[PDB]
Write an enzyme that holds these catalytic residues in place. Sequence first.
Site, short mmCIF file in Angstrom:
data_model
loop_
_atom_site.label_atom_id
_atom_site.label_comp_id
_atom_site.label_asym_id
_atom_site.label_seq_id
_atom_site.Cartn_x
_atom_site.Cartn_y
_atom_site.Cartn_z
N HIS A 351 -1.35 -4.96 8.86
CA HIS A 351 -1.75 -4.41 7.56
C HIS A 351 -2.82 -3.31 7.59
O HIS A 351 -3.07 -2.67 6.58
CB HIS A 351 -2.18 -5.53 6.62
CG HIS A 351 -1.03 -6.31 6.06
ND1 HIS A 351 -0.35 -5.92 4.93
CD2 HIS A 351 -0.43 -7.45 6.48
CE1 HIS A 351 0.61 -6.79 4.67
NE2 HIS A 351 0.59 -7.72 5.60
N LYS A 542 -8.77 -0.64 -7.53
CA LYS A 542 -8.55 -1.13 -6.17
C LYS A 542 -9.87 -1.74 -5.72
O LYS A 542 -10.91 -1.52 -6.35
CB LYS A 542 -8.12 0.00 -5.22
CG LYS A 542 -9.00 1.27 -5.25
CD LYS A 542 -8.36 2.42 -4.46
CE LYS A 542 -7.09 2.96 -5.15
NZ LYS A 542 -5.91 2.98 -4.23
N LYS A 548 -11.71 3.72 0.90
CA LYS A 548 -10.95 4.08 -0.31
C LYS A 548 -11.63 5.19 -1.13
O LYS A 548 -11.01 5.80 -2.00
CB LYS A 548 -10.69 2.84 -1.18
CG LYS A 548 -9.74 1.81 -0.55
CD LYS A 548 -9.56 0.59 -1.47
CE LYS A 548 -8.81 -0.55 -0.80
NZ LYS A 548 -7.32 -0.34 -0.75
N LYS A 654 2.76 1.24 -8.14
CA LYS A 654 2.67 0.73 -9.50
C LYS A 654 2.45 1.84 -10.52
O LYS A 654 3.12 1.86 -11.57
CB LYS A 654 1.55 -0.32 -9.62
CG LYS A 654 1.67 -1.48 -8.64
CD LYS A 654 0.44 -2.39 -8.70
CE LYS A 654 0.37 -3.31 -7.49
NZ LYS A 654 -0.90 -4.11 -7.49
#
Lengths: 810, 810
Positions: A351, A542, A548, A654
């Site tokens: 991942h 998130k 990020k 999404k």
Amino acid sequence: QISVRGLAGVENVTELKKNFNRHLHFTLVKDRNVATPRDYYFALAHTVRDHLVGRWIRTQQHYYEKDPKRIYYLSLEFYMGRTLQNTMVNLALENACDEATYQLGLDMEELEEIEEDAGLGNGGLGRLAACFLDSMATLGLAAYGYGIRYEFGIFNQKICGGWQMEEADDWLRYGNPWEKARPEFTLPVHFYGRVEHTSQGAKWVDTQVVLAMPYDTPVPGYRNNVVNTMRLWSAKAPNDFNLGYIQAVLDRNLAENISRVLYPNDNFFEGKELRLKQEYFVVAATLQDIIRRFKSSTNFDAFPDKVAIQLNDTHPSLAIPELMRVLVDLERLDWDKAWEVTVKTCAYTNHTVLPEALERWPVHLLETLLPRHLQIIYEINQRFLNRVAAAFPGDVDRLRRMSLVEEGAVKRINMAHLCIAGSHAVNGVARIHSEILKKTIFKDFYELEPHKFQNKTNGITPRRWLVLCNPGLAEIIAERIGEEYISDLDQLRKLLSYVDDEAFIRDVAKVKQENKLKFAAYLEREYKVHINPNSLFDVQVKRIHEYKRQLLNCLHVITLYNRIKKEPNKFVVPRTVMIGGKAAPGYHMAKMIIKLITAIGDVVNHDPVVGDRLRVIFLENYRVSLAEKVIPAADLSEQISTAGTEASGTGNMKFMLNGALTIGTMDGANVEMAEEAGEENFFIFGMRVEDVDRLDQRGYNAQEYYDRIPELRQIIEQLSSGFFSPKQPDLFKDIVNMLMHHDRFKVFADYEEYVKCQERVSALYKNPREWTRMVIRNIATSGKFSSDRTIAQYAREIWGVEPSRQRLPA
Amino acid sequence: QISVRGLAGVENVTELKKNFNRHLHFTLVKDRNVATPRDYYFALAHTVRDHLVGRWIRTQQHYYEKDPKRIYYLSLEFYMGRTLQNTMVNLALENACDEATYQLGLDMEELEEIEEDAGLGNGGLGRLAACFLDSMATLGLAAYGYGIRYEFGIFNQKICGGWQMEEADDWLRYGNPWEKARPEFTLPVHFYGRVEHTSQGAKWVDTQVVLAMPYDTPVPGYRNNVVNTMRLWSAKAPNDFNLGYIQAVLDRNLAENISRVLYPNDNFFEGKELRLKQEYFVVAATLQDIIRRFKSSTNFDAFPDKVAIQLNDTHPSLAIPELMRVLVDLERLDWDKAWEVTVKTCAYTNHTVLPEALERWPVHLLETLLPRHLQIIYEINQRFLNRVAAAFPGDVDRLRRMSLVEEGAVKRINMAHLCIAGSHAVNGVARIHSEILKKTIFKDFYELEPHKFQNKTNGITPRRWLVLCNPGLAEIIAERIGEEYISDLDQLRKLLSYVDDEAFIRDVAKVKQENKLKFAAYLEREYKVHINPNSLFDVQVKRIHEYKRQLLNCLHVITLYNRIKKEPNKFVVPRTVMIGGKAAPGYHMAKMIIKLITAIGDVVNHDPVVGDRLRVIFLENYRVSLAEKVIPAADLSEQISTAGTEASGTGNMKFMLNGALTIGTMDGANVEMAEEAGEENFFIFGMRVEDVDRLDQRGYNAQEYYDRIPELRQIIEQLSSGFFSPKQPDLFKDIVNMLMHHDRFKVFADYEEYVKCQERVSALYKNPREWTRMVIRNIATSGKFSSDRTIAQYAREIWGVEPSRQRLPA
Ligand SMILES: O=c1cc(-c2ccccc2)oc2cc(O)cc(O)c12
Ligand SMILES: O=c1cc(-c2ccccc2)oc2cc(O)cc(O)c12
């Protein structure tokens, strides 16, 4: 009301109403005179649950009779969210229940809001498991999700004085109507003890026993009458546990703590003993269940033909040595045969490539807790390294690089290395990520066994992430192309022929406006915050991370504010910038970032000169139920991780499905999203992976950007001098120091291109027709990102099973 | 099959069968192919529970409408046993369910054995609360039982190598179908903190909060459609509890430990902090519930007219200062008015005169845990002592004797003194006991307030203790006198006219023989022990205690064995001596007594010369469900406590109702039992209370009896020399030393009369007709000992409410 929500038949509505009243009376022990909204929710939940059980019993009976190959998806996290609406959707009961509740004088949407999220995950990894379960049931696979029933899921986030506060997620307080306790199927799990060697092999003796009690939750497929099982284990002390008397009973808590709480870390390894116990607990209980079911079909040759085990990250990696232990120590198979069976049974999904997320367990922990497993791991390592040495003679450094055992101050076991050695298939979660694995961190392993390495690009379920959360959009799509796309998302391509349809353009834009109005209303009701619904909704939701780059977003926000202050009477496209997400409780920098975001809002939202042209809102307690509200309302999706750091992302998918445009780096699945939609229909900026590599070889100097970009200089000066924290001038010193001197994620390097790209977003938004046309081109090409596609690829290329859309008899 | 078990109508049986199948499918999520006996039990339990809820809802609605005076029975113990058969009996469903299950191919008696006891009590005190709840519902009183939902009840007793071993009673493992969680009615309880004095009174601040979550259990009356509530509180941590992160969540266990386990002490005070927390927890949560319900009917003058609080022993004594706290600190009533209300609301039941059972809490514990309560207790004491001083001027020792505060090394609060001061009524539990209270330990208080002191002789419910456990006897009685006696036990007197009825004599004896056969069968099946069903069943079942004198029984058993060994070829009436009961885990002497009993069995049961003329069996894990099996099978009931020590006893009443004769001292309720039946129909022996007093004044010298009784001498020599423990010769040295030098309960002094009396028992047993005639005279006069009689007296003489046999509409 709307077509995709099913039929509301006379017989059905009457039957639902009577069963609702039956549950209110007999199940909840209430009458209409004292019943609260919560009682009404539970009466409806029990009524809908009734419709599952017949299908649930017959599905599991069908698997027993047909004996197909079974898929076991092992995960420490299942981020399920709410279950009521999802169950109604998949059973085609939504309109009938809406009618039934309406006739009883109740609003179903109000009742839906009462359900707690099953927040048994941190973010992307846990939510992927949840989407996967939905797709596996929809594709008619004999699949089982296995995990831990945490008493407390991911913490509830409160914001106090701009700072994150954590509180326990007591999700089971009022009960869970969806689960069924199965105390009769309780299994023992062993810890500690020692290894005795005898004439007939090794024996693991003097262990401490914890009981694993399963709770089963139904997982309905989309209108195919298939109901699969998610089985979650709960920890129980044996009755002779520590058996002065009172203290011995109280000490039972120590064993039961194993399933008490989810570790709240996202993409970060914390090497604590309790976590290791959790990992073995799920693996040991699950494998017993698998073997029991296999025997109730001596000959383990057919084991891989009847069983597939999928490891969601390295968290359940102990399945490899546990399976070896059972086969060698208990079933008495020879090592070589047991290993062949194990390899052919197990497959591993990676991942992330980020070093701090990699599980490297100290040998001394495994020595004490799982002495037999350590011995097996050592033996696996020796035999594996003998293969490496034979393939690459004289390559001594390769041997050290590839070892499962890492030497150093403290010896550690590299669990990723264990997984690759003991799995027939290893996959990344997006094309760029899978290529990075072969080129960098697992290059040595790829050279030895190239056939093991695969790609399986992530996806999301279109049931939860379109039909459920955005019925308005689902309906206008269905009006044009029918309903078949809900289980065949590639059909969305048919919408390309409506890109110049004036009615469709208007409808797409109308649905977005309604969603924005509904979300703006939610914010006022639940948080008393005011937002302008005509502004561009700019959202980044998130987990809070350095990689990020919520910080890059912050810098753009301040740039916009400074530009308005410099030229107040110049027109700018109004924006509502929304940032939400949880920080791991121990992650100092992430907690500082949350404070920064709120601190910026405090200045920006109250400046009279700004007006309603710019608003900065921190979305509190981001979780699955909130995602279902904010994503349909978004205009702009922020996917701005440093190239090479976000393995895939799923939030990106999404937003694409729900009519937001994307501003993003060429990272993770963003690359494939841009490929599908066309680069002209995507706002791509910043360094590619190759550019990051070039900068790293040269050395990243943040000072260079500070010196050459006057607008960036101003922001850093504002941060350092206390513009955003007047009463604590040096509050953000840690953030400034990191940015200037130790920024692993190169925030400054992407700043100029990011700001430029954002200007192009604002330019497009000024032209509503052209904005919407680009949106249509995104929605129409989002089909590849259905988890149905993803699961079909796992089925055919890893598990060796064929998916099916055929209905089971109702 | 039998009349008293109700009708099995065509419509009812069909409806029960269909609802059974519905629960098996929808509730348990099983089909007939995989269902186990346990699944079948649960399906039946849910089916029967359905019949309760309609009546439960309408009963509580009726109380809200009529607003009668409410009775609150506060107890730390409710020894409920199994619920399935009791519910069927009270709802008249037993025969219909028997038929319904029969037609489904199931044996209901087998299903009944699956249910766990709700063992939330130690013995007599907790079982009295359970019988009381049954009678209060049967007499139509608006009554509520309030206590603690212990996660672990009284321990399960295993016998290993002749010694008691304890294991956790995990009674909730498979779930509890009878309770309904009420999380919506959760209440806060406060601990620790400090007292601040302000201009407007005292304030209790900086407290720690534990939540009290109620679980409600229905309590059905006998065929009157009344269903009352037992509300049991469970401890829950608040969600911000201790809110690194993981440890804070794990530490929630500390708060929740309050309701984890029942203290396993019978008639013994253990002054531990956890126990004090339990006592306040139940009191604080309960009183909030009481006041809420009272307000939902400003004016607390009518409080005593609408509320009665009954204190079961001193365990909930904190109700007195807690009620004062709420009225004075929160409602702002003046002290004098609050006190008047409190006194008129509270009543106290004393259960023992034994010093080691009396609650005397160290001041330093109350100071830290409940600082405001200590201040209130001090104020109560001062005002009470001012009354004493005014009534008895110059009597300085009386003041010290009567003080709630006991001076010494550690200052303590005498909770019994607190209870008398703050209650309008104080009662003992049998006539002799109530007289002892006035003459000895509470003499000073009686002299000050004679009107407070009452008697309420204990009783047992004839539903559980006749109809349920002995249907064969209930039926033959009903055949002669009808069914009305089940709620009017005085009607049993009508059986006196059948004492010379040859058919009745035969039937009474037949029922006893069948019961003995059934119990002998139970012993072989579950424990593989062999007993002769033609022998006299001599049973002593009760908690293991020095005061209850299981040791005196042991001495008689050894006497019988020695006599057989001396004259092997002489005829003796064959006996099976059964002794059962649990010892408190820390009670060394009681644990030694259990070992002695098993040690005697080891010798006696394997001596070839004895044969089947004498058998000694220890009944393992004595509890309510076992009492229901052994009591109907008993011929001889051993009630042999030292005169003045057993306040009442209730086991005695159970045996009398079920056709056993009694050998006993004139202690507790034995006196009233002999009075009712006639002394000629009772085997009375040993010292009276007056004789014990005379011996105490003189000084008890055990050596005197040893020297003068050769048979006693032999036994002591056998014990000391290792006859009953060859491999550990001095195993019983502690027992011998206690008997010879420090026996507070005068075992030797009653030995000769006991042995003589036992010879008269054997003589009577040789004449079956005359034995049975005496039995009939016992059963016929057992009516006074119905808890219906007891509760009617509490209602009329303490609570000021009128009982009712009138049916509520079904
Ligand atoms: O949750 C964390 C994630 C990362 C983290 C940092 C960079 C890249 C990926 C994860 O760092 C941490 C450092 C800490 O001291 C404590 C934490 O809980 C974290
Ligand atoms: O449960 C007990 C009861 C009595 C006890 C003794 C005489 C009369 C009444 C109760 O004594 C005890 C002494 C201990 O050291 C420990 C105990 O658990 C007990």
